[PDB]
């Protein structure tokens, strides 16, 4: 799945993960740490919408 940061437009792609911030590819959004935030704008998970 992809999820979009409603603040900045960043797309969290679960296939890509977010390895620079400790997230391996294939990590589902729901598996992201509570303290993970948009690596662009720092918005919390609450500001993401699933596409
Ligand atoms: Fe953002």
CA of 1 to the centre of ligand 1 (A): 17
Q: List, in order of start, the domains of the chain with CATH numbers.
A: 1-51 (2.20.28.10)
Q: Where are the beta strands (DSSP E) in the chain?
A: 2-5, 11-13, 48-50
Resolution (A): 1.8
Q: How was this structure determined?
A: neutron
Closest CA to 17 of 9, 8, 27: 27
CA–centroid distance, 47 to ligand 1, in Å, is 8
Give the three-state DSSP class for 38.
Answer: coil
- CA-to-CA distance for 33 and 22, rounded, in angstroms? 10
Residues belonging to the binding site for Fe cation are 5, 8, 38, 41
């Amino acid at each position: 799945a992809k999820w979009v940061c409603k603040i900045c437009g960043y797309i969290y792609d679960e296939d890509a993960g977010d390895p620079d911030n400790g997230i391996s590819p294939g990590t589902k959004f729901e598996e992201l740490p509570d303290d993970w935030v948009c690596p662009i704008c720092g918005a919390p998970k609450s500001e993401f919408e699933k596409l």
